[PDB]
Design a protein around this ligand. Structure first.
Ligand SMILES: [Mg+2]
Ligand SMILES: [Zn+2]
Lengths: 14, 55, 94, 1112, 147, 56, 221, 170, 102
RNA sequence: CCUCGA
DNA sequence: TATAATGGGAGCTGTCACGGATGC
DNA sequence: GCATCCGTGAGTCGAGGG
């Protein structure tokens, strides 16, 4: 959907 | 020869590369002083063609 | 209305064939300088100059009038194309 | 000439200032006359108080702003293509919370455009108007659910872009749902976040049968406000981590944050009046002592449940009611864009507060004004409501300023505009004119403020009524909104009055828009005037009550298209509004106080007032308007003339002695004429041109630039290659055409030379050069020439140069030259004329005088209108205008016939008899009896039943004259028209649509870049579009070659079109067409889409339409 | 049309309706390669079925299909026509996947190509007609007569 | 009296019987005389030509 | 010889309802909701209306303007769709040889269903004029032969015959039953209505059909 | 978009014959400009084509004999007139042009109905068919006087109007 | 730069491709130069065409044209001079090539 | 885009 | 080239009819 | 089988103003 939200989630994994 | 039919079909990466006269490797259009096209950019005469007739 | 348009429509099986006949004949007349006309000197369409009556420059007016006389022959596959071209160039040079 | 006015209605109040909707709105938004500390929290002051303080130095706060004086006057602004604006400064203080250090400074935020006296603007040298916008007012509404009868939807609506719309519905499963940003969730959750408990909601909402049961969910009451808040934050934000402070922030910004959510002041008022509550702020809830506190939601749900159950005193809402639609005027729209630019400035302020030295920061180091500047610049240059001002005539501008649009930013997108928005709602009465709207796509979406109407501080439109108590009509006039008006019984303005008492036992009145017959005891108010129902333009139509509305629309609209004429006249029949329109449009110049006129000049009037002070009024003379019509003023006083306050000094454009002069009074015959007025065409007499009727001045502006190039400079010069003295005759030493010269199409206005480029001489050029032994010059002729179909007399030249005082141009341009060309336009064949009753047509024939129908005394008629235009148009007002015009033509007088209270048939007949005496007894004393032709026409008229048999010829001619008809002789035969003909004076205007501007032709010309098809438009020497439907026409005729020609040889087959032009100039037949270039463009664009498009032959083997040039 | 006083001949409506009925749907493939539910043209299925009946095979069971004017125009054989109508993306993707050949039968296709349309003076029925005077006609007749 | 329908039928019948050349000549003649006579006919519109019947 | 009466009766201008509004009453008007106001405008444009009457009328005036405005778009769109379905339909041959035809009925069932009554003249003309008979018809001692293009007189005769009970339906060649591929043949189409004679092969007949249906589109109320 | 085309306001042309239309002189010059150049060469008006074009470039360089040449150019030819919207095929029709002074196209009374044309400000576009085939099509198939009956109904389409009807009725 | 689709590009003509008038003008120029070259001898017309570069696109030096005709560079220069001279005479006489010089 | 005209 | 700095920010929405996937 | 969300369409030609 929203790419920056997706990237921020993937970053919040580590 | 006279045109009779018109066909439309998917294009293979090989077909596409066969259309191509060169790869556009830089996101450059024209030079800020000379106003001429940049090498390997979107307007390069090396790929697309001469800007002036027979020159 | 174009003079005698009803008879012209009588001559063909489809009005568009009339149009094709007339246009090809107008092209013949223009290409050969009207030297190939089937029109007698008195049947020549005339236009009123400031000096006096001169010939009509309009090849379509001509071609229609020619068609009304019966002296023209129209139809499909009456002669090979290049043969008609060369024979007209022979009888009427450009 | 004497002016007789009709009508018995005495109007208590004059029309309000007609541009006040603009001027007062903008004054309120700016408050520039108010000392800062006394300013209210409205306007740009409100924008400042919304943005500031800015926090997280640590704090930046706002003290006050101020507006300076404009850098340049309005005339100079029009000259130099500037904006008429004032510098804006704001006093800000930076405060470090820890250091306590306080640094305060007056920072410069850029310029704000200023409104002129008449309510317009000057943006980049062009006058513009900010059009008011109509929209749904903020508030709480209740509508019937269209899906489920008996169920209703509650809607909470804030101001545009001040928060989301919220819906409350009662689901088929019984639970009450809230929808926000297209997200349905149970309302009980948010109710719990508000801090409500099941006990409070059960005692509040329990009285409604079975409804509160859908509100009871135990899993919701089992969690404290914190957990329910996190629950809602997860329901509204999938994927975002549910941190407590983040949920508080989001929900606060959604409902309680006044910097983000804002009902109007009107939104708050309407919510309060509807739900029976009182609001502390303008949000739906508050953040108080760490917890959310409810304002709006619970009353809304109470009202919704009550409307569903059917409990009395609860009703659905009509969203088209003018009590639920409001107007956003210029001040509000500009303040909104100011607020947006300020928000950007504050985001940049915080971004700067995080970076940079924390110790050393000023207000100036923190604030970048550029985004605010940008917001103002875009609102005034490119907004939809910011329109190129229509100043064709003064009424054009006044009407433009009183417009109301339903489109625009936050407005209805078209095709979302059905019948309801476009309807005239009963509440339009007295507020929005029911006739003045565009025909076509915009119908109903652009409307006009009624003449007496006013927009209040909440943005609702109010109309005046007279207080009536016990059959007595006071002079107290109360301005009501539609909501207030629906409370009363309002009698019609024409109700018979003896003194101030009602004289009819049956009175026509309105109750909630419904017409009702009522006793004087029941009358609560009364209309002020019929004028109050119509716009300013409709109010200019005499005998409006006799014109069907669909043509009154056209006459109304077309008055704004009338061209100012050099001999313009006021109408011989007027409505009485003709002078207020001149006064309020600031057309004419007036006397400021009593005094004596000292000097009178073509250019200036000097007046000495009662103070002894000497005031000098300069006159605008031959100025060009937005539409190219001459705007100028002429002195109407004389030296030594004594003048009182408010007396006419100079007449503006289209003004005769202070009266609105949109056209000319012409002598008209209503009869067919040899087909030359077939289907609304018009016939006119050459006599109209001889005496300069319908002649207008028009000024055109031409502009050219000389810039620095990479091949050398352009220059304005008189030295132009290959041009004779014949070509350069009217050019002065510098190369600009001389003032006063006559310029024709092809003539040079400004000589300019440009250095040639990419120059490779082709061998023909080299050989021709050697043959004629002439060097090819370095430069070439790029001069500005008169375009085809234009020309006139040069009346002005402006020249701006780089390196000259006060002059700085866009980078690279050395100089700019503007030439002004005036032309005098006589009426001609194809020009559009029209009257105030929607009768419009184009002049199709101009007859010499001796062919015009003429009266027996030798007077010929001015124009001949076809009677076939009248029946189905049903605009009989023009006929009454014509009869009264005949009467006034012979009595030498003019009239004022107010709409719905004006000249009736019997009084027109009296005037016509008085006129007949002048028209006939003069003859009978001059020694002439009745004429043979008149006798024959009288016989014909007797057969028509138009006169009574047995009366004398004079009695019968008078019977005809009383019907408006007269004997008329055909000027070609001298024989009479077999009938008596309607003849009289009619007011007729020349509209802006003149065949001079519209006639265009093209053989060949410029082609478009990508498509290689001709350009469009008269200015680009363009070609006509042969669209899909013209193609269908040609296909239907079966004209294959005509169509193929349209598609190839005439548009974008390059080889074809070149070969065709060469063939025709050689006298050869045209060559066969080939592939149109835009088909090749299509093929290459499909290849760009990774689709291979192959032209094949009958053996299915490819064919190359690119002739190998695209294959390796 | 009658209620508004418009006189309009039935045959125009009949032509449009005939285009609305252009297609059919397969109920049983029979011996064909077609599938149950496959939509195609009545003309094409009648051709296939006469080919299978003259071959002795089983004919395709098919049912008539009414589709409205938009859907009928988008289902036409010519992809140039359909793509220029609307749904340009959908039409072009399915045409490209199927490798469709446009035979330029109708008017829109040839307009798009700039070709001379197949109607009126561009009809194959009349466009090859020749005109000759009796002089040139007999002068060619003699040249045919000497050989 | 000659009106819209009868003149339409005249034009149609003339087309059928005499061809479009003659029908065009006929149409021009009808045009000429119609315009000529409508000029001198006395047709006009005054407010008194909209006759309120007493039956109203 | 009154001007309004003359213009109306001749067809040069005006219709009864407009003349009525000019002379008699103006009439009942609609509220914005489409509901009708109980009391009408009793005035004529000769007499002049009251401001209230004028206002009451403005509702319908505006609704009609908006109807026209929103209508022309739908008409144009419809025309384009009709063009796109029909554009390939051309008269391609002189006869496809089909033995199939349609039967235009001359009688329609009464709404009472009391009988089957005659159709209106114009309707029969619009279904029959210019068509080609697909079968011999013998009526009123006249033979209308198979292959005959029905003149207007042939149609009026067939109407007369139906009035005498001789024929209730006419068999006729029609584009519905033509078997010409990519279009239509000459006999199944019949007259080129613009020329009152059989259609020329090559006539772009589908475009003509689309334009014929679409052109009155903005008149339909 | 297309070459050899123009547009102007339409005006009623009662004196016109059914196959004619009034065409402004200057419109006609620009529309037929290549033919005019050719003819000006065919006569003494210009030594060559380029001189003739430079002669028509400026309005005060234009002299009388070029108008007579224009008359000799347009003889027998037709132009197409078009009114928008083009609802059916008679929104385009062919006419012999009669050169008029003034800037307004003159349209024949009997064709207005087919064009849905009146004279409250309507404007039409002119197109010049170029080839002998284009002119044959336009003069035969699209000429106004050859298209008298509706292709939709069969009834007369060019028929007496209200003004015409009024005199005949009277 | 700014966007062509602001459309804003539909007001932008094409200065590159020669117009129909320019194409026809160069056509008549080539035809009239050949008309005038025909009034010379074939050798002097060929010398002019080689010196102007018309035959192969570029202009030859006097030594190349002279070695092409087998003659001294002074001789080929004199032939070019007299050919140009006869051209100037014919042109002053018939005034046919004047208009094309702009 | 807007407004305007048909 | 070295103090430490560690998950964004804009968000008004008054149409309607069609095919088609998505769910209950 | 039947509600629901997504996507795609919704007159032409002009003119001007940008
Ligand atoms: Mg009109
Ligand atoms: Zn058939």
């Amino acid at each position: 959907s929203d790419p920056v939200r997706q990237y921020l989630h993937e970053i919040g994994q580590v | 020869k006279e045109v009779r039919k018109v066909r439309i079909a998917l294009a293979s990466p090989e077909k596409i590369r066969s259309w191509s006269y060169g790869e556009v490797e830089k996101p450059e259009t024209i030079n800020y002083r000379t106003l001429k096209p940049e090498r390997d950019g979107l307007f390069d005469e090396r790929i697309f063609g001469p800007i002036k007739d027979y020159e | 209305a174009e003079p005698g348009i009803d008879k012209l429509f009588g001559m063909v099986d489809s009005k568009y064939r009339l149009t094709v006949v007339v246009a090809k004949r107008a092209q013949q007349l223009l290409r050969h300088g009207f030297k190939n006309t089937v029109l007698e000197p008195e049947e020549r369409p005339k236009m009123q100059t400031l000096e006096g009556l001169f010939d009509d420059p309009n090849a379509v007016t001509w071609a229609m009038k020619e068609l009304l006389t019966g002296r023209l022959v129209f139809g499909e596959n009456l002669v090979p194309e290049d043969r008609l071209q060369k024979e007209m160039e022979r009888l009427y040079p450009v | 000439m004497e002016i007789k006015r009709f009508g018995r209605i005495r109007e208590v109040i004059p029309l309000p200032p007609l541009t006040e909707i603009q001027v007062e709105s903008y004054r309120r938004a700016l408050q520039a006359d108010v000392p800062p500390e006394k300013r209210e929290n409205v306007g740009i002051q409100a924008a400042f108080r919304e943005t500031f303080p800015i926090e997280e130095g640590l704090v930046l706060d706002f003290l006050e702003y101020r507006l300076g004086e404009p850098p340049f006057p309005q005339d100079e602004c029009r000259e130099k293509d500037l904006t008429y604006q004032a510098p804006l400064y704001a006093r800000l203080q930076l405060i470090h919370k820890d250091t306590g250090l306080i640094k305060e400074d007056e920072v410069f935020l850029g310029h704000i455009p200023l409104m002129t006296e008449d309510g317009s603007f000057i943006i980049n040298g062009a006058d513009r108007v900010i059009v008011s916008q109509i929209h749904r007012s903020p508030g709480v509404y209740f509508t019937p659910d269209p899906a489920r009868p008996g169920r209703y939807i509650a809607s909470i609506i804030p101001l545009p872009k001040r928060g989301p719309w919220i819906d409350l519905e009662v689901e088929p499963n019984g639970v009450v749902s809230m929808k926000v940003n297209k997200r349905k969730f149970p309302l009980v959750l948010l109710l719990r976040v508000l801090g409500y408990d099941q006990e409070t909601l059960a005692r509040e909402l329990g009285a409604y049968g079975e409804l509160v049961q859908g509100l009871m969910d135990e899993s919701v009451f089992a969690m404290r406000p914190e957990e329910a808040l996190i629950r809602l934050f997860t329901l509204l934000r999938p994927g975002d981590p549910p941190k407590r402070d983040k949920a508080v922030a989001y929900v606060y910004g959604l409902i309680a944050d006044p910097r983000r959510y804002d009902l109007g002041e009107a939104g708050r008022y309407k919510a309060e009046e509807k739900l029976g509550i009182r609001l502390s702020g303008r949000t739906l809830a508050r953040f108080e002592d760490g917890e959310f506190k409810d304002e709006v939601f619970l009353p809304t749900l109470r009202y919704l449940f009550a409307l569903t159950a059917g409990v009395p005193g609860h009703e659905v809402d009509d969203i088209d009611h003018l009590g639920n639609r409001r107007i956003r005027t210029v001040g509000e729209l500009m303040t909104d864009q100011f607020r947006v630019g300020l928000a950007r400035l504050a985001r940049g302020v915080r971004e700067r507060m995080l970076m940079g030295s924390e110790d050393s920061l000023t207000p100036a180091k923190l604030v970048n004004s550029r985004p605010l500047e940008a917001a103002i610049r875009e609102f005034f240059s490119r907004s939809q409501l910011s329109q190129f001002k229509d100043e064709t005539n003064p009424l054009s501008s006044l009407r433009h300023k009183r417009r109301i649009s339903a489109l625009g930013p936050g407005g209805l997108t078209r095709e979302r505009a059905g019948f309801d928005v476009r309807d005239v709602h009963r509440t339009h009465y007295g507020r929005i004119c029911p006739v003045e709207t565009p025909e076509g796509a915009n119908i109903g979406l652009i409307t006009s403020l009624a003449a007496y109407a006013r927009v209040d501080e909440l943005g609702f439109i109010r109309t005046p009524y007279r207080r009536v108590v016990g059959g007595v009509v006071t002079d107290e006039v109360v301005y009501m909104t539609a909501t207030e008006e629906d409370r009363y019984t309002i009698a019609q303005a024409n109700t018979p009055l003896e003194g101030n008492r009602i004289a009819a036992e049956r009175v026509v009145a309105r109750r909630k828009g419904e017409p009702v017959i009522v006793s004087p005891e029941e009358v609560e108010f009364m209309d002020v005037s019929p004028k109050q129902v119509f716009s300013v333009n409709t109010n200019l139509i005499p005998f409006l009550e006799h014109d069907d509305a669909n043509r009154a629309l056209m006459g109304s609209n077309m008055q704004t298209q009338a061209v100012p004429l050099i001999r313009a006249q006021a109408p011989v029949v007027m409505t009485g509004l003709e002078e207020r329109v001149v006064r309020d449009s600031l057309a004419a110049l007036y006397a400021e106080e009593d005094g004596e006129v000292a000097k009178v000049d073509g250019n200036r009037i000097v007046v000495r007032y009662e103070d002894g002070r000497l005031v000098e009024y300069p006159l605008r003379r031959f100025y060009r308007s937005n539409q190219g019509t001459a705007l100028d003023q002429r002195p109407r006083v004389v030296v030594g003339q004594r003048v009182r306050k408010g007396d006419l000094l100079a007449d503006g454009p289209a003004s005769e002695n202070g009266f609105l002069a949109l056209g000319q009074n012409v002598l008209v015959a209503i009869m067919p004429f040899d087909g030359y007025n077939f289907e609304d065409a018009i016939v006119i007499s050459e006599e109209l041109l001889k005496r300069d009727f319908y002649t207008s001045i028009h000024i055109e502006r031409y502009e050219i630039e000389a810039r620095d190039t990479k091949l050398g400079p352009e220059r304005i010069t008189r030295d132009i290659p290959h041009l004779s003295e014949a070509a350069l005759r009217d050019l002065d030493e510098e190369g600009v055409v001389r003032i006063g010269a006559e310029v024709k199409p092809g003539d040079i206005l400004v000589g300019r030379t440009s250095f040639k480029g990419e120059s490779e001489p082709t061998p023909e050029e080299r050989l021709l050069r050697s043959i004629f032994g002439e060097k090819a010059r370095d430069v070439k002729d790029t001069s500005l020439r008169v375009p085809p179909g234009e020309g006139g007399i040069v009346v002005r030249t402006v020249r701006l140069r780089r390196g000259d005082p006060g002059v700085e141009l866009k980078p690279g341009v050395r100089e700019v030259v503007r030439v002004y060309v005036a032309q005098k336009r006589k009426l001609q064949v194809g020009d559009k004329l029209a009257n105030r009753h929607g009768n419009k047509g184009v002049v199709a024939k101009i007859l010499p005088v001796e062919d015009m129908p003429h009266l027996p005394d030798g007077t010929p008629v001015d124009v001949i209108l076809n009677p076939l235009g009248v029946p189905s148009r049903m605009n009989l007002g023009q006929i009454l205008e014509t009869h009264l015009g005949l009467a006034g033509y012979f009595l030498g007088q003019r009239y004022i016939s107010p709409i719905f209270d004006g000249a009736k048939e019997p009084e027109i007949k009296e005037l016509l008899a008085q006129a007949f005496e002048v028209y006939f007894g003069k003859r009978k004393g001059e020694g002439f009896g009745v004429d043979k032709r008149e006798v024959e026409v009288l016989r014909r008229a007797e057969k028509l039943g138009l006169v009574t048999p047995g009366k004398t010829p004079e009695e019968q001619l008078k019977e005809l004259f009383l019907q408006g008809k007269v004997v008329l002789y055909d000027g070609r035969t001298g024989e009479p028209i077999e009938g008596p003909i309607v003849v009289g004076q009619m007011f007729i205007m020349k509209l802006y649509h003149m065949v001079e501007d519209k006639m265009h032709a093209r053989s060949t010309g410029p082609y478009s870049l990508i498509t290689q098809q001709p350009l469009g438009g008269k200015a680009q020497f363009g070609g006509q579009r042969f669209g899909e439907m013209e193609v269908w026409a040609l296909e239907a005729y079966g004209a294959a070659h005509t169509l193929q020609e349209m598609l190839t040889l005439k548009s974008d087959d390059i080889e074809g079109r070149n070969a065709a032009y060469e063939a025709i100039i050689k006298g050869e037949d045209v060559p066969e067409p080939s592939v149109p270039e835009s088909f090749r463009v299509l093929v290459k664009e499909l290849q760009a889409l990774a689709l291979d498009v192959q032209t094949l032959d009958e053996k299915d083997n490819p064919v190359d339409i690119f002739e190998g040039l695209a294959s390796k | 049309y009658r209620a508004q006083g418009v006189k309009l001949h039935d045959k125009h409506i009949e032509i449009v309706v005939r285009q609305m009925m252009k297609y059919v749907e397969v109920t049983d493939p029979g011996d064909s390669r077609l599938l149950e539910g496959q939509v195609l043209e009545k003309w094409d299925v009648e051709a296939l079925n006469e080919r299978l009946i003259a071959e002795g095979k089983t004919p395709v069971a098919w049912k008539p299909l009414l589709m409205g004017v938009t859907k009928s125009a988008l289902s036409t054989k010519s992809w140039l026509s359909a793509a220029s109508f609307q749904n340009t993306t959908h039409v072009l993707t399915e045409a490209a996947i199927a490798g469709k050949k446009d035979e330029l039968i109708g008017l829109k296709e040839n307009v798009i190509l700039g070709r001379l349309i197949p109607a009126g003076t561009g009809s194959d029925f009349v466009r090859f007609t020749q005109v000759v005077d009796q002089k040139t006609l007999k002068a060619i007749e003699e040249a045919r007569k000497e050989a | 009296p000659q009106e819209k329908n009868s003149l339409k039928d005249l034009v149609y019948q003339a087309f059928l019987r005499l061809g479009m050349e003659k029908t065009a000549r006929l149409l021009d003649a009808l045009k000429y005389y119609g315009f000529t006579f409508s000029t001198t006919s006395g047709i006009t519109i005054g407010i008194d030509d909209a006759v309120i019947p007493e039956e109203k | 010889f009154n001007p309004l009466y003359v213009m109306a009766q001749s067809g040069a201008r005006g219709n009864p309802q407009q003349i009525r509004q000019l002379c008699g009453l103006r009439g009942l008007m609609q509220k914005p909701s489409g509901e009708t106001f109980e009391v009408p405008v009793r005035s004529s444009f000769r007499e002049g209306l009251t401001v209230l009457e004028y206002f009451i009328s403005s509702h319908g005036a505006r609704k009609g303007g908006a109807d026209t405005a929103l209508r022309t778009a739908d008409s144009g769109y419809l025309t384009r769709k009709l063009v796109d379905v029909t554009h390939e339909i051309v008269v391609r041959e002189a006869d496809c040889g089909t033995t199939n035809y349609i039967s235009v009925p001359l009688f329609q069932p009464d709404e009472v269903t009391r009988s089957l009554r005659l159709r209106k003249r114009a309707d029969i003309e619009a279904g029959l004029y210019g068509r080609v008979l697909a079968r011999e018809v013998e009526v009123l001692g006249v033979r209308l032969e198979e292959g005959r293009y029905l003149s207007m007189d042939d149609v009026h005769l067939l109407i007369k015959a139906a009035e005498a009970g001789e024929i209730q339906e006419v068999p006729v060649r029609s584009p519905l039953t033509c078997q010409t591929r990519y279009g239509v043949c000459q006999k199944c189409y019949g007259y080129d209505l613009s020329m009152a004679r059989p259609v020329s092969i090559g006539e772009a007949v589908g475009i003509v059909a689309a334009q014929s249906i679409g052109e009155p589109g903005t008149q339909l109320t | 978009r297309v070459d050899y085309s123009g547009r102007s306001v339409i005006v009623v042309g009662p004196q016109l014959k059914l196959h004619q239309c009034g065409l402004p002189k200057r419109m006609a010059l620009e529309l037929f400009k290549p033919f005019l150049l050719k003819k000006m060469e065919e006569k003494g008006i210009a030594p060559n084509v380029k001189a003739a074009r430079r002669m028509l470039e400026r309005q005060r360089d234009i002299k009388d004999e070029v108008w007579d040449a224009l008359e000799e150019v347009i003889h027998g030819k037709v132009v197409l007139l078009n009114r928008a919207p083009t609802l059916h095929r008679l929104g385009i029709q062919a006419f012999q042009p009669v050169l008029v002074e003034g800037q307004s196209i003159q349209l024949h009374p009997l064709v207005c109905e087919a064009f849905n044309a009146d004279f409250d400000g309507d404007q039409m576009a002119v197109h010049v068919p170029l080839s002998s085939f284009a002119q044959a099509e336009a003069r035969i198939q699209m000429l106004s006087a050859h298209n008298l009956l509706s292709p939709a109904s069969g009834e007369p389409l060019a028929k007496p109007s209200r003004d015409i009807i009024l005199g005949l009725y009277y | 730069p700014v966007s062509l689709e602001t459309f804003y590009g539909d007001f932008i003509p094409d200065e590159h491709l020669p117009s129909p008038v320019d194409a026809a003008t160069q056509s008549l120029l080539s035809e009239e130069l050949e008309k005038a070259l025909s009034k010379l001898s074939e050798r002097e017309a060929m010398v002019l065409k080689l010196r102007k570069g018309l035959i192969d696109g570029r202009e030859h030096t006097l030594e190349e044209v002279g070695a092409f005709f087998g003659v001294t560079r002074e001789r080929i220069r004199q032939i070019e001079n007299k050919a140009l001279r006869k051209l100037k005479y014919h042109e002053s006489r018939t005034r046919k090539l004047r208009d094309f010089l702009d």
